[PDB]
Structures are given as structure tokens and as C-alpha cells.
Amino acid sequence: DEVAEKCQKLFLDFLEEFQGEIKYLQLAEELIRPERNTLVVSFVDLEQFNQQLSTTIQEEFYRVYPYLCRALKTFVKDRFYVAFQDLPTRHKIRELTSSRIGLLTRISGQVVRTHPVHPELVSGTFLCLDCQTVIRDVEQQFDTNKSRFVDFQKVRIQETQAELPRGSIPRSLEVILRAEAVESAQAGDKCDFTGTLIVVPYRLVFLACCVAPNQMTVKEWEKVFEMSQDKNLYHNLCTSLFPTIHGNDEVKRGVLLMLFGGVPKTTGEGTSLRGDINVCIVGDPSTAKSQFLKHVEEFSPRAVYTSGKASSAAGLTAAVVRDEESHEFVIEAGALMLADNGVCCIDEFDKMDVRDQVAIHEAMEQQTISITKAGVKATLNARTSILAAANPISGHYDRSKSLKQNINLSAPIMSRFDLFFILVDECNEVTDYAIARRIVDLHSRIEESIDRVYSLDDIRRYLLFARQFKPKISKESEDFIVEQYKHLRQRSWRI
Amino acid sequence: EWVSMAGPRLEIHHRFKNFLRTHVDSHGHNVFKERISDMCKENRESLVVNYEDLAAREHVLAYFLPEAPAELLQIFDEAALEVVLAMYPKYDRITNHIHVRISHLPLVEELRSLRQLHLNQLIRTSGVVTSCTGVLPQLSQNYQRIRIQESPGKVAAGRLPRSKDAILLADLVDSCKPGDEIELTGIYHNNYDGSLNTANGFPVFATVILANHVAKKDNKVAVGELTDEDVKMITSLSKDQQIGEKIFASIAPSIYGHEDIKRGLALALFGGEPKNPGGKHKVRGDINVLLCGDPGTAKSQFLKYIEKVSSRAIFTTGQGASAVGLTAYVQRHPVSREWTLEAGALVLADRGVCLIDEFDKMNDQDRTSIHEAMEQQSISISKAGIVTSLQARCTVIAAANPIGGRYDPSLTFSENVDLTEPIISRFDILCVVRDTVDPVQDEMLARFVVGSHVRHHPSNKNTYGVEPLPQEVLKKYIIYAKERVHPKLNQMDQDKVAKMYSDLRKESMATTVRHIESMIRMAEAHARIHLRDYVIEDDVNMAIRVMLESFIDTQKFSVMRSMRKTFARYLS
Amino acid sequence: PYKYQVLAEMFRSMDTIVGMLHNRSETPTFAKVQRGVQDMMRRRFEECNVGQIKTVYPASYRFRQERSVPTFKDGTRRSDYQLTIEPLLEQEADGAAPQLTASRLLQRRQIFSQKLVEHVKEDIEPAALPQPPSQDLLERIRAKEAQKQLAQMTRCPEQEQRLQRLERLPELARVLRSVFVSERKPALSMEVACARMVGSCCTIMSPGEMEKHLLLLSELLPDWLSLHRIRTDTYVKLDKAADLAHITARLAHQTRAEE
Ligand SMILES: Nc1ncnc2c1ncn2[C@@H]1O[C@H](COP(=O)(O)OP(=O)(O)OP(O)(O)=S)[C@@H](O)[C@H]1O
Ligand SMILES: Nc1ncnc2c1ncn2[C@@H]1O[C@H](COP(=O)(O)OP(=O)(O)OP(O)(O)=S)[C@@H](O)[C@H]1O
Ligand SMILES: [Mg+2]
Ligand SMILES: [Mg+2]
């Protein structure tokens, strides 16, 4: 292939002339290190240096990759594998078709299963048993001492929830990792893999090379700065986050606070203190019990929604299922572990059986879930914030009975919610007028009846910027908290 | 390749013969002649040679052994065989082949650390045995195939335990049992398997270790690894008159108050001395602790701290623990399809500690299997035509919440907890924790909690009045006390305990032998705390005090006042 | 001396560990060397004694601070510096890679002992190891200022919005080019192109904003980028051979002019 040799020469040119310091000289020198055998090359540098080479590599990656490896070996020997990063285009798993075979693309998914590291024989030195002829450098079409082996890892990935179209089963894909890409991915993580779609006998498999998990523009940064100095920022955010909901602003403040969340702390004894907030809303019907769940689900991309009775114990935390091909037992993820570092919303929490809530118990407080079933022993992180919605017994708050008799929930469950709001409906003419006018205005004037102080994207950016700070507690705050807790505890839902 | 040369090969063989017939220990004794005489007396088929002495004497042999294991080991086996024939010509009649075993390899590697570079090299590894096959004959020999998983204590949280295959020949056959922690020195070879190649779609070699030496990982190795500075620090701590106070205060610094619970848990952790009087009945030397608590008392925090401290620890939850999961079960192997035993949580908890959370959620059917392991510390599995016995010497700490979420002081302890009487009887220490509204105690709790919160910020990163010990120092003290002390009860006044037990019978029928046994092993553990070869009666007094406190804590309010009045002599 | 004897013994242990790590193509880290020495001699190992060795015979090793050292599944972050040690060996004339043979080991321990004897003939200070890198009047003045600022902002807001968008046009344009590089197509619809750009842009934006930005690009720079109205849709065509640097310069000039 003449074009392959041209690509090799052009890659040598890029390695030898890219710059006032050549970025890749130190990387090539470190490639001499035995633990380092893959080179990471930015795609943007390749495309800016020249465009014909960039297009050729993006189009015939499988065709020229061994020539790229040969170029790397030649460049290093003058004084090994090639990895690429920062491809500007993201693609969906449902987009993977046969027309894209051999193209350098990066795919986003979630790792669900992992397999141990295996040696893969690349070039084998074969000894003939008839004439004792040694055949060296035999490539494999998919003497151990003199042959070459490369570390291998197999990964099974699943479609992301956001990209999943309604009513569709999330397809799974097999990913092959080699050399430094081995063991760089962990089960339950979301990753973008850069590589190609190869043809296995047929079968569809992705060969990957890399994994994925101050510089902001001036105007966005200045908008964030300006809105950070607002004196009425709290109320403005509360109003903008729920423009169509009338009253009940305490619930708005609570959900905003749990969106912000606290800081987790780990003691010297290794014990982890939960830095999250769990919220329970219980109320008579016709209130806004659900709408908050939908708003927080649509706003936060890391939100998961679920119903009460339709969810089983296995579906919430995790399940143990036997794998068909491996003839062993593996773990299928539940909703809680998929909602990691996010928010999980449960509707009609009362209808859930006690057998399910007792399973929730561990993830509620210890923030982790442990499984000891059928010879499978594991612990998994469940760092989630739970928002639960429910109604009182018989659907109506009966004032003829005590407050405790009006909630059919266990004592620890009542204890483990930070905020517990109870909503009571009353017949007032002014409230009726306000509710009716708001509803009819929304029904008639859909868009012109919305006044948002800040954009939803702006709120998201501000929240992302704010969540990384870790404030310190002052001594004045310390003794104020001490005295406030004194007064509060000196007076069902025990404190 | 260079070793395969005939000249150097033969010369090294004779040099190894001279090493066998010439080495002198520090005491002037030719050790290998005593070893070979012992082997001849025992009619064994293997010889054990220390790698350290060989490295000290012949550096070239120590360099060659990890690099060319199979050929050099075969040559050494031949040399040992001919040395035996020259020394004991008749020994050919009892054995035809003798194998050389290499022990104490300096390089120890983990199952996770196995790569391509270690292929066909002698490696030392550590782990726990999970399943084993039977003795299989070969048309060459004895065969054993075993499956080894990583030790659960060494495995970090959130990551599955990996498993490997191991092969034992002749003498090494049946030298280990499932659930036994062992270290191995063996060759990391690769095997050709076409099924893996077809499944994965590319050439894959299943790496299987051929072990040369097997050594069960008793705590003797841990004792050997101890630095003499650790021993001197432990001894200096032992002479302190307030060693007990600081030891108790060193547990759960982040939790305020609750002296009795930490006292009982430490006393159970140090453990008693298991005994086998006559080999007819076995008296357990283990303490089973039950913790019944009102919500909000940080029971899970105590369990987590115990999980972290213990060298060997397994954590289980109530809902996720089935009867099959906790115990070993029989399964058909997916490849070879012979019946195999997979160890449960308790089996892997042997010599370690097992924690049960929300024990009140246990199904009664799952509860039934527990009593056998609790009473006898051994499990007999009779399934699918296979009857086996496995060791279950473990210390069990169980947590529980009263029915209804609140402990009623007007009822008996049996009524408040949904557990049968035998289960409670198997437990040695019972601790109930209640919630009281005390303003001064509330102030203390709030102040301590906020102080701990301030201390342990990542940016920033007692009742007895004694300074807590460092965690590493406490762990080293625990290990040394577990592995050195064996107290003797030669100075106990039987009349006092007999009268106390008669009073206990009177006041229990007004409202057993295993209670006496629990108190005895409690006194033994308290003596072990002070590193005393003989038990002083102060240990007995403290054990009586804490046992009486635990007993009165389980009674109704209308009678505990009378019990305290009657037993004010001992509680004071 | 006894301290010098301990120094020589641990130097021998260090040399053995370094040779074992280096002969199998493995990078010698400080933690592995410390673990090996502690197992071999049952004694504490620390950087002060390494600095003492460097003071005694500095030619033994080269000490470096390095990153990107694979520590297996130990949970170690990448930003953690690691102190690596490289043995300093004379290159043989045979062309083979130098290896710490037992002869070289004996030579090194003999030279270390000779240096110790020379020091006696004359504690050792450790060498510096490479460290890792009225109220009414005020209210009326405020009201006057607010009225003046309101009169200032009576100018059409869109005048600044375009300016805002003018700062966003270049970068997005780059992405657009890559999009047409990726799709192997001469022209694309508004919907698919906007969806892909949003899915690849660094900023979360609405499809309508992308459409308005595309319209602004078409109106400012028609020669590069063309729009064709077909049936019920508008399609986008671009010239892929144009130099991006000159176009970026033109966009910067246009933004400056609009300022
Ligand atoms: N304050 C309010 N502002 C605007 N609409 C409201 C308000 N309160 C009630 N509504 C309307 O009433 C509906 C009832 O809200 P939902 O949360 O769906 O019902 P619910 O109270 O959760 O009862 P369940 O749990 O579904 S049986 C809302 O979807 C709104 O259309
Ligand atoms: N006495 C205490 N001193 C200090 N912190 C405490 C104390 N009691 C509770 N806490 C804190 O409360 C947190 C939650 O307590 P938990 O362990 O969940 O309560 P619990 O007693 O175990 O009852 P359950 O099992 O959760 S129903 C702990 O992680 C501690 O931080
Ligand atoms: Mg609802
Ligand atoms: Mg708890």
C-alpha cells in the first residue's frame, strides 16, 4: 500500500516537526520505559498540522495503524503502540452501522460487566514437528518463549439512559482493550472509547485505545460572576426553578438545597459521613406531589425516576443473575447504583412493601449496598439522594386521629429523612382564585406567561461551579449550632 | 538455554550434591542429614530445602532457580534420589522418585499482580482455598486440582475476588483443605485451551500455577514478620497498670460514651482459649455478641469499625444473606462437572470475625443452620452424596433492632426481640441500648459530634481520662496477645462461684452451664489482655461484674432493682 | 563503625533490589525498594539513609521525580509524584544493554566499603534528594443614576446579543468544519447538523440558538457558507478547501468592526 507508506512518512514528519518545544519528544523518551508502551496523540494537533493525513487516518485507521506503529518504532529507535484522543465528534451506540467499519470514532456508554486480563498471542514462533523448522513472526487471524504476547481486557457496555429512545431495549456492545487500556475501566462507570468497529466472525465488536470519564469563555464567566453577587439570588433561583408552581416555596427551598448538597467527610477511623440530603413529601392528593419529581428529573441530567409498587427489591439495589455464556453468576445493576452521585425519585412510596424498604435501608444511611448471595460477595457504592413522594393513610389526613396514626411508616425510615414535609389542603377563596387563574393562564398563554430570572442552562452551570467548593465551619457557627440544637432537642419524629 | 549445555548442567548437579553433603549450620549440624533421616523414618516422598541458605552459599543457583525452574528442579530431584540411594540403598524399595521442595521464596506476589512477565517462573503467592477436586490417577501419579481466591481481608472494597487454578502432584495431593489460608511457591505456566480461543475469538492461554511448596498461612508467619521494636513496645505497654483503660478508650474514638458495649466487644475480640477436654467434647473459646439497640445509637458505626480493625473480617447484611450464601454449598463445576464445595461467609470467617447486620430480619429456616456452627464451630455438609466437615471457629457479632422500633423496659428481653430462646442462649454477651432525654448528656453528645466534624474536614486534613493508643499499635498488640498468651486457671476459688451460681439459679427460677463457660473464657480473655501466663482473681471479678450487668440488663424493670440490691456486693 | 556497617549492609540490599527490579525491565520505585529492604533486613527504611548513601557514593544512582507510574489497582491518583532510582552503569563495548551482574554488584559494595574506610580515615550528613516539583439625598441620587442607566439601556438589546454571538461564532465554525469532514457529504439539513453540533459543542445550547448562529454565519460570510431552500427545508453547504486561519482573521476583524 503506497498510501500506507505515505501515511507512515507523514506521521514521522508530524512526530519530528510538531511544536517552541516538540511535545512528543519527552513522551517518546518515556516510551523506552518498560511500563510505558503506548503513545497518546491529540487529534487536534494532527488536523492542524495537516488535513490530508488527518482525514486519511480518520478514514483508514485500520489500514494504516500498523504503519503508524512502525513509524513510532522508527522514531523511538532513532534516539510500541499509538493512542489517539480528543476526537471532536461523539456518536451513539444505535448509530453504529456497517458503513462505519474502519472509521476512527469514539463511543459513549456505561460499563456493566468486566472480564479478567488475558494474554493474547500476536506474533507466534511456530516449530514444525516434521522438519524442525522454526517459523517466526506469524500474525494471528483472531514456541511460547519466543512469541509476543499483549495484555487483553474484554468489556461489556450498555447504552446510556438519556440516549435510550422510549420503549427500546438498550443494546450491549463488546469492547476490546489492549496494553495500557487494560484495567483502566471499572464496572458501573460511564466512559467514551476511541477506536474502531471491527468485524468478528458475523459479530460486531469495538476495538478501543483510550478511555474517558479557568478556560471558560469570558462572557459566561462574567455572567456567573454577576449572578453570584446577587443579593436576592436565593429567592430568584427558587422562583425561576419552578415558574409554573404556585406557593409551597418551602418545598422549593428544600429541593434546591438537596440539589446543592453538603460535603462528605471520612473519619480517621475510615468511617464515611454522608454529605447528601434525603427528602420526603407526604400530602393529601391534588397537591404538587409529582410535579416536583418531574421538574427535578427534566432539569438534572443525573436524575432517575421510578414508581413504588412496580419496583422489586432486586430492581432497586442490584440482582444476581446467571450469565448464559460463562455459566457463572454475575450482578445486574439496580436503579440506586445507576443513580450514583445523582438523585433518585420514588413515587407512591407508601405502596412499596416492607420487604423492599428494608432493602433500601442500607443505601439510605451507609450509602453502600452489600450482596452476599449464592456464593457472590460484593459491596457497591450507592451515593444517591432520595426524593420520596407519598400520601397519608386512606388518602386523607383525618384530624380526628393523632399525627403518628396518620403515617404508616417505620420509625427508622421516618428518622433517616433530613426534611419531612406534610401538606394539608384547605378551602380558601383567595387560594382557589390564585390556583384557578394560574392554571387557566398556563393553559391559554403557554409561553408568554413565563418569566424566568435566570436561564436553566445558567442555573446548571452555576450549580456545577458551586458544587466543587468545600466551606469551612466557623467557631461562631459552631457554638450557634450547639445552642440551637440544645434548644431544639430539649423539646413521633424524634430528633 | 545456557543451562541446557551438558557440561555446566552436570557440573551444577555435582555442585548441588556437594551442597547437600557439605552445608553446615550455625550450630555445626549438617541439617539435611537429619532431615533425610527423618524423611526415611516417615517414608515421605519429598525433601524441603531452604532457599535462603542456598542463596547464601551458591548465588548462581539462586539466580538460576527462578529462571529455569523445571529442568533445574528435575536435576535436583535426580541428585537427591542418588544421594538417598548412596546413603540408604534400601530406600529404593519404598520409594522410586523423590522431589525437592523450595521454601521461603523472598519474592511474594498477589493473584492480581500476575502478568505475562511471570510466565514459566517460580512465584510465591498467598490466598485462601475455595474448592478442591479428588485424587486422580495418571498414566505417567496423584493429581489434585484446586481453586484459590484472594484473601478477603487483603481485597479492597468494591472489587470482586479473583480466582485461579492450582495443581498438586503426589505428596502435595490432599495437603490442603477448602477454606484454608495458604501460601504457595510454584511455577506460573500457561496452558493451551481451544474453548477459550473460540469463545473470546483470539488466542487465549489459561494460566495455571503448578505449586512446588504448600504452606498453610497460620499466624506463625505473622509472628515472624513482627519487628522486635513492636515486641518491646508491646511489653512496655503490658507493664502499665492502666493498660486496660487505655485499650478500651482506644476503640471507637469518634463515638461518645457507651462504655459497656466497647468493653464487651473488645473482650470478645481478644478471644478466649478453645479447649478439647478429653477429645470427647470440645469447649469453644469464642464469644458471640448480640447488640440490640434503639435507632440512633451508631451500631452500624461500631460494626464498620470492627470490620476495619480486624486483620480478617467479612461484612454481611440481613437481607442479602441466605442460608446457602452464609455456608458452603455443593455445585457442579461448569467445565469438569464434578461435585465441588464453595465456601460461604462463615467458612471464610474461620479464625476471623463475622458481622451480621439486622439479624432480626433472618428467616427462621436460615436461622436453623446457624446453631450448629455457633455451638460446635464446625459445619457438616451432607449434600449430593458428599459428606464433609469444615472448620467454623469464628467470632460472631450480631446487631438487632426491637420489634416496633422501641425497646420496652416493661417486658422481658425475649419478648422485645423476635429471636428464639436457643439463639439467645448461644450468645455469650447481650447488650441493649436505649435512648434517654438527658440535657447534660445531650450537650456532651452535641459538643463531641461537632468537634469531630470540625477535626475531620478534608481541608483540615474521654470517660476514663486515658489517652487512646494508635491504631497500628493496637493491631500489633492484638496480634501478639492472640499468638503468644495461653493463660491457666490454677487459682480460682470454686466455692465463691458455686454459691454465686446457686444464687443465679434461685433468681432465674424466681423470674446454665454455658454461662459458666462464657464467664471462664471471659476471664481467660481478660487475662490475655494483660499478657499474663496465669490468671489473677481480678480477672474473675471483672468478668463476674460485666456478666452480672449484662444479665440484669435483660430483665424487667420491676425486678432489676431487687437484683441490684441483692448483688450490690459484686457491682460495687 | 556499627552505623557504617549498617549503612553498607543496607546499601548492598538496595543494590540487590535495584538490580532485581531493573534486570526484568521494571521501573524501580521507592516504595518497592523500601518493601524489599524491610523484608530482607527486618529494619526501617527511609529517605534519610538514601540521602546518606548519595552523600557517600553519589555515582551509584540517579534520582528523579516522575509521574505516570502504573501502580496497578492501588487507587493512586495520577498527580502523585514518585521518586524513581536509575542505576548508573558504564556502557559495555559489546553494544548490549548494561545489566547488574554479580561482578558489578561486588565491585559496587567494595567501592562503597572503600569510601566508608576513607571517611573513617579522615554521622554522615544526608544528601539533598530531589524533591517533587441624609437618606433622602442618597436615595434621590441613586434614583437619578438608575434613570440615567435606564436611558442608557433604552438602546436595543439585540445590538449586544449579536456581539455576544459574535464571540461564539469562530469556535463553533471550527466544529462545523469538522462535522462536514466527518459526514462525507456536500450538504446537510438544519436539523441533523444542529443536533450534531449541540451534541459536540462545549456549551449546552438550544437548537434555535444554533439556527440563529448559522443564519448569522451565512449572512456575514456568504462566500464560504451557502444555504439552499429546497421544498420545506433549508440545506447547508460549505467549501472545505478554504483556509481556516484567514477566515478566523476575517471573523475577528468583523467582530472588531461591530464593536
Ligand atoms: N400549586 C399548584 N400550581 C400549579 N398547578 C398545581 C398546583 N397544585 C396542583 N396543581 C395541579 O394539580 C395537579 C396535581 O399534581 P400531581 O402532583 O400530579 O398530583 P398528586 O398531588 O401527586 O396526586 P397523586 O400522587 O398523583 S395521586 C398538577 O399536575 C397541576 O396540574
Ligand atoms: N452516640 C453517638 N455519638 C456520635 N455520633 C453518633 C451517635 N449516635 C449516632 N451518631 C451518628 O449518627 C449516624 C447515624 O447513626 P446510625 O448508625 O444510622 O444509627 P443506628 O443506631 O445504627 O440505628 P440504625 O441501624 O441506623 S436503624 C452515625 O453515623 C453517627 O455519625
Ligand atoms: Mg402525584
Ligand atoms: Mg445502624
Curated annotation (Swiss-Prot), chain A:
Ranges where the MCM domain occurs: 233-440
Q: What is its EC number?
A: 3.6.4.12
* Residues the entry annotates as binding ATP: 246, 286-290, 391
This protein's record includes keyword Transmembrane helix: no
Q: Which domain of life is it from?
A: Eukaryota
Q: Which residues form a coiled coil?
A: none
Residue list for modification Phosphoserine: 168
Summarize the impact of residue 119 to S: Found in a patient with mild developmental delay and autism spectrum disorder; uncertain significance
Catalysed reaction, written as an equation: ATP + H2O = ADP + phosphate + H(+)
PTMs? O-glycosylated (O-GlcNAcylated), in a cell cycle-dependent manner.
Location in the cell: Nucleus; Chromosome
Kindly state which keywords UniProt assigns to this record, in alphabetical order: Acetylation, ATP-binding, Cell cycle, Chromosome, DNA replication, DNA-binding, Glycoprotein, Helicase, Hydrolase, Nucleotide-binding, Nucleus, Phosphoprotein
Judged by the first EC level, this protein's enzyme class is hydrolase
Q: Which GO terms describe its biological process?
A: DNA replication; DNA replication initiation; double-strand break repair via break-induced replication; mitotic DNA replication; regulation of DNA-templated DNA replication initiation
The short motif Arginine finger is annotated over 415-418
Q: Which GO terms describe its cellular component?
A: chromosome, telomeric region; CMG complex; cytosol; MCM complex; nucleoplasm; nucleus
UniProt lists the family membership as follows: Belongs to the MCM family.
Q: What else is known?
A: Early fractionation of eukaryotic MCM proteins yielded a variety of dimeric, trimeric and tetrameric complexes with unclear biological significance. Specifically a MCM467 subcomplex is shown to have in vitro helicase activity which is inhibited by the MCM2 subunit. The MCM2-7 hexamer is the proposed physiological active complex.
Q: What does this gene product do?
A: Acts as a component of the MCM2-7 complex (MCM complex) which is the replicative helicase essential for 'once per cell cycle' DNA replication initiation and elongation in eukaryotic cells. Core component of CDC45-MCM-GINS (CMG) helicase, the molecular machine that unwinds template DNA during replication, and around which the replisome is built.
Recorded protein name is DNA replication licensing factor MCM6
Gene that this polypeptide is encoded by: MCM6
Q: Which residues of the full protein are shown?
A: 20 to 616 of 821
UniProtKB/Swiss-Prot annotation, chain B:
Task: State its role.
Answer: Acts as a component of the MCM2-7 complex (MCM complex) which is the replicative helicase essential for 'once per cell cycle' DNA replication initiation and elongation in eukaryotic cells. Core component of CDC45-MCM-GINS (CMG) helicase, the molecular machine that unwinds template DNA during replication, and around which the replisome is built.
- Molecular function in Gene Ontology: ATP binding; ATP hydrolysis activity; DNA binding; DNA helicase activity; DNA replication origin binding; enzyme binding; histone binding; single-stranded DNA binding
Query: Which residues belong to any copy of the MCM domain?
Result: 243-449
Stated EC number for the protein is 3.6.4.12
Q: Which residues form a coiled coil?
A: none
Name recorded for this polypeptide: DNA replication licensing factor MCM2
Origin species, per record, is Homo sapiens (Human)
Could you tell me where this protein is found in the cell? Nucleus; Chromosome
Write down which residues bear the modification named N6-acetyllysine.
33
Residues bound to ADP are 300-301
Question: Catalytic activity annotated for this protein?
Answer: ATP + H2O = ADP + phosphate + H(+)
The UniProt entry's GO CC annotations, sorted and at most eight, read: chromatin; chromosome, telomeric region; cilium; CMG complex; cytoplasm; cytosol; intracellular membrane-bounded organelle; MCM complex
Query: Which family, according to the similarity comment?
Result: Belongs to the MCM family.
* Disease the record associates with this protein: Deafness, autosomal dominant, 70: A form of non-syndromic sensorineural hearing loss. Sensorineural deafness results from damage to the neural receptors of the inner ear, the nerve pathways to the brain, or the area of the brain that receives sound information. DFNA70 is characterized by slowly progressive, postlingual hearing impairment.
Record keyword Nucleotide-binding present: yes
- Give any extra note attached to this record: Early fractionation of eukaryotic MCM proteins yielded a variety of dimeric, trimeric and tetrameric complexes with unclear biological significance. Specifically a MCM467 subcomplex is shown to have in vitro helicase activity which is inhibited by the MCM2 subunit. The MCM2-7 hexamer is the proposed physiological active complex.
UniProtKB/Swiss-Prot annotation, chain C:
Q: How is it modified after translation?
A: Two independent E3 ubiquitin ligase complexes, SCF(SKP2) and the DCX(DTL) complex, mediated CDT1 degradation in S phase. Ubiquitinated by the DCX(DTL) complex, in response to DNA damage, leading to its degradation. Ubiquitination by the DCX(DTL) complex is necessary to ensure proper cell cycle regulation and is PCNA-dependent: interacts with PCNA via its PIP-box, while the presence of the containing the 'K+4' motif in the PIP box, recruit the DCX(DTL) complex, leading to its degradation. Binding to GMNN is not affected by phosphorylation.
- Cystine residue pairs: none
Superkingdom of the organism of origin: Eukaryota
- According to the record, the residues making up region (Interaction with LRWD1) are 166-259
Q: What does the entry say induces or represses the expression of this protein?
A: Induced by E2F transcription factors.
Oligomer status and interactors: Interacts with GMNN; the interaction inhibits binding of the MCM complex to origins of replication. Interacts with MCM6. Interacts with CDC6; are mutually dependent on one another for loading MCM complexes onto chromatin. Interacts with PCNA. Interacts with LRWD1 during G1 phase and during mitosis. Interacts with NDC80 subunit of the NDC80 complex; leading to kinetochore localization. Interacts with GRWD1; origin binding of GRWD1 is dependent on CDT1. Interacts with KAT7. Interacts with ubiquitin-binding protein FAF1; the interaction is likely to promote CDT1 degradation.
Written domain comment of the UniProt record = The PIP-box K+4 motif mediates both the interaction with PCNA and the recruitment of the DCX(DTL) complex: while the PIP-box interacts with PCNA, the presence of the K+4 submotif, recruits the DCX(DTL) complex, leading to its ubiquitination.
- What is stated as this protein's family in its record? Belongs to the Cdt1 family.
- Tell me the protein's name: DNA replication factor Cdt1
Species this chain originates from: Homo sapiens
Name the gene: CDT1
Question: Covered range within the whole protein?
Answer: 187 to 544 of 546
